[model samples]
Target: MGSHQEYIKKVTDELKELIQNVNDDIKEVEKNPEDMEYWNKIYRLVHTMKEITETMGFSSVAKVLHTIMNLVDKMLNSEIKITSDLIDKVKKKLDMVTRELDKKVSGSYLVPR
Candidate 1:
């Protein structure tokens, strides 16, 4: 409904907060390799961000996060397993989202007034 720039700011702010929290999640994942709680924490957080990103038309990032979230979910249930590699992959994707968000907020993206 309005400009992407408008929503982008709000999105970026939310993302910044998510990034802070996710970094903590990453730490827990790093500290506890096989902790389902830590894996589930990231799964839920990424799923939340996936919904927001999908709503905001960021399908590329959303889809990646969604895929990874599903994998994490499977890991939680022991249907699938990882060797901390999923943690790194999710962290990499989160880093990309953070970088893009920074660009959006830094005036690289503009909407007509």
Candidate 2:
């Protein structure tokens, strides 16, 4: 059986790296909101995050990222344009995700077995 501490360490390290990349993409998008490259960067970050979180058994969180990623993917493909409303929504969701992660990592509640 995996020790709780060991599992937490591995998952947290992976989550930290994922968050770093996602934040970097967010900064990139902010730098040039209309740039397709920036959108692609965000898409890639979210896609990577979806995969990682699912693999880590955090499908609930991954699905949220997946939904936002779908939104970004549409924008990246020029199906939608960047707007303050969309940006605000996505950013807020990302912030909430990180906060949820913080709660889990801090062991504030029991994680599903």
Candidate 3:
């Protein structure tokens, strides 16, 4: 029912939106680290993003979220403290996906490999 060529851009678009959507969750986590509610929200956001990106064949982006969820999983289970360093790492990786999509969308280099 549609052209396949535009689908990649569309899929990447949702990935970017998902990252942007996490801003509120990030804010809430910083505001109340003691609240597992914020952390769980953050985890589920990344969890859904991981599934969508993987379904669309964006392996690198999915990998980023996968690791983010791994860290979040530890935090949720009390396997590790929600350290400042870990939160910073999560933010950095999400930023990395943004940059990667910029490259993929602007150039002829192929993704999904």
Candidate 4:
């Protein structure tokens, strides 16, 4: 159990690092909305995060990532333009995910066993 817990701790740290990278990518995309590559990277990162969080039973975090990924899909398909408001909304949700993850690792959030 100790080793298993340590593995979870390592994964949590990695998740935080990945979130930081995603946040940076969002800033880059904000500075250059014309960059399709940046947008694609955001979409990919959110998609990857969703999968990992779900596998780890972090449903709340996974849900936010899933929602953000859908928004990115709409942007990619031209159904909607990526606006600052949209980015802000996504960032807010990302903040929620971070909070939940923090609570989870600290044993403050109850995750279904």
Candidate 5:
């Protein structure tokens, strides 16, 4: 109903805001690969996004966020080194997330019935 679309719109705004903040944090992370604080902050941001998307029925978006979060974990544990390629790859995935998000929003994206 009206409340459903209204809720989705609010959630959609939140997701975009989260992505923007992550991009901001990524810029800092790129400058200082050893900055664990920013990386952790990115993790927390994506973690919240993932839960919200899942709860709101965006499984694909949730999956992407999950993978992104895992990449953060890898970075945190030093399982992966931060490189230009890694940074670009992360950005590309964020790009992918937004595209997938918009495509869904225009149709029957929210399936939480």
Candidate 6:
């Protein structure tokens, strides 16, 4: 495959991995609220995903993830507690990113007017 194709594949794979990690972290932390490490892991993953999507020209995906990352950062800073509801909100947006990726590849924004 060409370099561009390889780059796209690698980023896409990592995005999928990070999304799974975020979900897994949510599940684990639900059982152990004391384990703040899970929160850190998710924060880093979302931050990284935001950077990757922005660099890949996936601005729509990046924008949503950026908001998620800011929220995660607030949790990290003790400004807010991470809860199941918060995680669910993030997951919903992440799933939107997956759908946005599909729309991008198929050559349309498909965003509601």
lDDT of 5 by residue, 1-113 (tens): 54568777787888888889989888887788768788889889989988987887777678888998888888877667677678767778876877887777465555664
Would you estimate the TM-scores of all the predictions? 0.74, 0.72, 0.75, 0.80, 0.80, 0.79
State the lDDT of candidate 6 residue by residue for 8-51, as single tens digits: 78888888888888878877866765466877788788888888
Candidate 3 vs 6: which has more lDDT: 6
Where is model 6 more than 4 Å wrong at Cα?
1-3, 110-113
- Stretches > 4 Å off in candidate 4: 1-6, 105-113
Could you give the candidate ranking by TM-score, starting with the highest? 5, 4, 6, 3, 1, 2
Instruction: Give a tens-digit lDDT track for model 3, residues 77-98.
Output: 6657788666778888877877
User: Whose lDDT is greatest here?
Assistant: 5
Superposed Cα deviation of residue 87, candidate 3 (Å): 0.9
lDDT of 1 by residue, 38-113 (tens): 7777778877788887886765667667777767877776556666776787788788887765554444345564
TM-score of candidate 6 to 2 decimals: 0.79
1 or 5: which has the higher lDDT? 5
Clashing pairs in 4: none
lDDT score, candidate 3: 0.75
Clashes of each: 0, 0, 0, 0, 0, 0
Say which prediction, candidate 1 or candidate 5, comes out ahead on TM-score. Answer: 5
Model 1: CA > 4 A from native: 1-8, 102-113
Q: Relative to the true structure, how large is the alpha-carbon lDDT of every model?
A: 0.74, 0.72, 0.75, 0.76, 0.81, 0.77
lDDT of 5: 0.81
* TM match of model 1 to true structure: 0.74
